[PDB]
Structure 1
Amino acid sequence: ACDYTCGSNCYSSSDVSTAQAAGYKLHEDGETVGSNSYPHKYNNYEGFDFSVSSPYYEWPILSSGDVYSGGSPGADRVVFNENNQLAGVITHTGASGNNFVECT
């Protein structure tokens, strides 16, 4: 079973932790990867009711199992905060335009 289901993509908790660790490391060092500069601030315009405090940062999680290193980020993201606490896993899949919906 999937711990997180983003459209057709299936992720386990270990998939999420691995992605999160990479994005947080880059955040701590003040560095970014990709043309869209990840990780970067996630404003939560959608208004998700996260259990942890802001600010939030988004980082791509890939269905390939690889850690993001540039190029197309796909539709899925892991959102973490300043304390490296997982806020949630979100996706563009099943959402209008560039909006997000939570992965179930």
Structure 2
Amino acid sequence: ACDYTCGSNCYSSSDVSTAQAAGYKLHEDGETVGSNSYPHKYNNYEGFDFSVSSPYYEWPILSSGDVYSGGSPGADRVVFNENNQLAGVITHTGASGNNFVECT
């Protein structure tokens, strides 16, 4: 069973925790990776009900289980805040353009 389903991708809570840890560390270091410079700020214009406060930041989560290191980020993301609290798992899959929907 998947703790989060993004389209056809299944993630366990460990896969979320591992990607969040990596992304938070780059945030603390003032560093980014990838042509699109992740982690970067996330603005919640779609109004997802995140129960943690912003600012929010997004970091790719990979279906492969590997930590994102540059290269294609795929469509899935972990969102965390300034206090390293998990806000949610969203994806561009099934959303028009560069918009998002939440993973279920």
Same fold by TM-score greater than 0.5: yes
Q: Distance in 2 between matches of 1:86 and 1:79?
A: 6
Q: Distance in 2 between matches of 1:19 and 1:58?
A: 10
Please, which runs of 5 or more residues in structure 2 have no aligned partner?
none
Q: Distance in 2 between matches of 1:18 and 1:55?
A: 21
How far apart are residue 45 of structure 1 and its match? 1.5
Q: Distance in 1 between matches of 2:56 and 2:8?
A: 25
Q: Distance in 1 between matches of 2:72 and 2:58?
A: 14
Question: Identity percentage over the alignment?
Answer: 100
So what's the TM-score if we normalise by structure 2?
A: 0.99
**C-alpha RMSD of the superposition:** 0.5
Q: Distance in 2 between matches of 1:7 and 1:27?
A: 27
For 1:69, what is the secondary structure of its paired residue? Answer: coil
How far apart are residue 47 of structure 1 and its match? 1.2
Please, which runs of 5 or more residues in structure 1 have no aligned partner?
none
Structure 1: 4+ residue segments shifted above 3 A: none
Could you give the per-residue CA deviations for residues 37-60 of structure 1, whole angstroms, max 9, x where no partner exists?
A: 000000111111100000000000
So what's the TM-score if we normalise by structure 1?
A: 0.99
Q: Distance in 2 between matches of 1:43 and 1:93?
A: 18
Aligned counterpart, 1:54: 54
The number of equivalent residue pairs is 104
